[PDB]
């Protein structure tokens, strides 16, 4: 089994399994049933941005989602990732569609993690920034229905020639290199993530959502995780 | 008067003004009597490191102070700087000695400020890093007894020709350019500062401390602020 | 007088003072008569990008100006800046109009300088990035007709309410803090500059140009530097 | 065979295959016989620093190697990597010993690559920094006798338990993720690499050297490339 820690941008309310009755953003720790959630005033057809942050001093996983000139949605949860996740992990982006669908497009993605290990001036750091994706992005691990190059964008789920969303689709993108998320010797550890997305459904009835996640290096799409399980969990517990 | 937000590294206990009875680390918001403090096992003669962090999402100001292979001191305070400070500020380092003394030497200093706009993605940033100080450091505003180039180091208080600390001394060093610490349109705003220091004392007990501060662009050293006022406050209120 | 090292994006061909007979880009060292020019196919009304780079190992100042989905113009010049400029300088953008005119709008500006001394890891660095300009941009020194905040942009020369450019106009924007561009104890030194611009002439007959420049700390606009002198030089010698 | 572009730090003079008669730094493109070399005053037992740089505008690979308060060695070669290397590559460090030996210890290593493509300032970037190596560095591909965690350093060739180097040794360390080194839609492309090293030898003469290299993704050690071939080439052609 994998260990997933995610920040879902949930477009469809699945009250049958704990989702509030409106689109929302939330923090998921080893389960699809969020530990915290916030109402999200999603805008069909508009590009948004998600900013997720974390540091080992405060120990709070926070996220902000916004649209230009609109209001932002924020969610936070006090969690000590050292007691939840492996020391080495992989970071990625995931999306799905079920009976209902939307386009789960990624226009840009950035990530930075730093580990100050006790010593002065002895810091390990990792940073990548994709402002454009190519047909053969050799530094990404594509899973499910994910593809790159489509207008220099990253399409996580299946979209037809006529730019139309398809149902029952799941796709993930993981950065190639493993990331050292925490350590014991470190005096300060922190990470920062950011992405811009374009979710649009012609019927104006979207599903199911996008999720930024952190997992064990060898994570793969669970069977049956289409739709409401955001391609991250095996069951809805 | 000036608007001061500071993180003090207080080496002497002036219990008559609130100081706990032991060296400490504290967060000062417009008053010398810390809002929250933490015990700090200062190590005479050793180079230590401090890291200060803040972001508009969480609205918490945190600090960690350590020496390699030893424990760390942490102190945090929930404060919405939008209500305390002006939109444009200057950042600096301050230090003082009174009846007792110590060296207040800075070996390195870095700062990073970031502000993401309302019309999402209009990120503006400022970053400076000093791992060495020149005799004529034109990008710093030195106030009081502060001098640079002294071994490639920044001395905040007066040291003698033979390297011995001096009493009744105050000095400050401010970066030349004003910083846009916050905005009403920003989605996310955050800063991070790091400095290494060497505090050495030849007498019974060290005094008085070093402090990282944020002020109004035109801040000057308050009259008589040597000793327990750390070059930042005019009175002990 | 002042010491000016500049990269001019010259819109009007003044053959009488040495300008080639078409819009061009050139390297200027203390004179308006470029040491090296390259033909530039200016595109009226379109946003362009200029990248300027330099390092002390190669001792080459190069510049690339381009427009999306269009070919670019490059120009380089071998010059040891240690012999031309002072140690501490100021960086900026300058523009002008004369009999003919154009809009000289800047949409973004970033600068990074690094100085690696004789100390392992001991690099000093400065970085600033403006992706949006405020009405009261306290970290800039505006000279002449330059203003900011107008559409979140920096307008180097005068533009009337109805968006119409004006003639006989001059303006300059310089970053507030002095920059240590070179140092004798340096193993390596280098800077990188980038800005996006919009030059539009409703008459389809533009003049005079924009320039990225490096000067002495207290540089000011020369008397009678309007038009062909781009606000940089006091004569055409 | 693989495709190799390397910057060598050659401690032993093999004049029989072209080496100058003294320790040197050189630029290798597909062959062990450097295209250009420069005399290097290697200091046995001391920590040195290597700095490599390249950009697509000037098309010249340069390198500087130095020790604190000592002169530096510099080498440059005009080379269009677009014509030598594939689009996707891997970067690493390589070292070897033969009949003679030395320690090929790496104390830190950083790399930064930037790629600006077909848009109004659309950059892609990758940055990594190791100021300390762990016993299990998941983001590095170790080959041959290379090992990490050894006092937090990286030892490229075999060292004895007491601390003495072994002969006939070879080892490499490549960063885990592929790097998009060049692209046809790019306006500008550039990279910067830096590492500090420690070569000590109890022998009458040290051998054989360290090399910073760039190769095809699936590169591995050529059989018998110990000694003078520096773990990079099959033969001496
Ligand atoms: Ca749901
Ligand atoms: Ca005190
Ligand atoms: Ca002209
Ligand atoms: Ca050799
Ligand atoms: Mn949910
Ligand atoms: Mn106190
Ligand atoms: Mn000209
Ligand atoms: Mn050689």
XYZ file of C-alpha atoms in Angstrom, chain C residues 47-49 51 53 55 57-58 60-69 72 74-76 108 110 114 116 118-121 187-188 190 192 194-196, chain D residues 47-51 53 55 57-58 60-64 66-70 72 74-76 108 114 116 118-121 131 187-188 190 192 194 196:
74
model
C 5.526 42.871 -26.753
C 9.211 42.011 -26.968
C 11.835 40.585 -24.601
C 18.030 39.401 -22.329
C 24.260 38.755 -19.951
C 30.574 37.361 -16.876
C 35.555 34.830 -17.256
C 34.424 35.453 -20.855
C 31.527 39.520 -23.230
C 28.405 41.626 -23.035
C 25.713 40.021 -25.165
C 22.081 40.892 -25.799
C 19.166 39.000 -27.351
C 15.971 40.799 -28.379
C 13.041 38.784 -29.660
C 9.271 38.542 -30.317
C 7.332 35.269 -29.917
C 7.213 33.226 -33.127
C 15.701 37.247 -32.829
C 21.771 39.130 -31.078
C 24.741 41.426 -30.505
C 27.924 40.880 -28.463
C 8.513 43.425 -16.289
C 14.474 41.374 -13.314
C 26.554 37.377 -8.163
C 32.155 34.822 -5.859
C 38.173 33.957 -2.416
C 36.121 31.908 0.081
C 34.499 28.524 -0.711
C 30.713 29.115 -1.075
C 37.043 34.534 -8.749
C 33.913 35.017 -10.856
C 28.340 38.018 -13.587
C 21.861 38.810 -16.128
C 15.719 40.850 -18.565
C 12.745 43.062 -19.413
C 9.607 42.887 -21.556
C 40.166 21.946 -0.836
C 39.629 23.513 -4.263
C 36.640 24.835 -6.256
C 35.537 24.231 -9.846
C 33.072 26.479 -11.692
C 29.360 27.812 -17.357
C 25.100 29.821 -22.709
C 24.124 33.105 -27.187
C 27.947 33.101 -27.054
C 31.453 28.910 -25.461
C 32.082 26.497 -22.588
C 34.372 27.981 -19.930
C 35.793 26.751 -16.638
C 37.726 28.251 -13.729
C 40.968 27.706 -7.873
C 42.113 27.546 -4.248
C 41.642 30.339 -1.645
C 44.153 33.156 -1.988
C 45.848 31.494 -4.971
C 43.020 30.486 -10.803
C 40.725 29.143 -16.744
C 39.838 27.405 -20.010
C 37.286 28.291 -22.731
C 29.511 19.822 -2.301
C 17.565 27.351 -17.603
C 13.621 30.101 -22.312
C 8.782 30.180 -27.792
C 6.821 32.684 -25.646
C 7.035 36.160 -24.063
C 9.466 35.090 -21.329
C 26.250 20.544 0.633
C 15.786 32.055 -27.230
C 18.380 31.413 -24.525
C 22.398 28.151 -20.114
C 26.186 26.670 -14.325
C 29.949 24.119 -9.119
C 34.381 21.684 -4.190
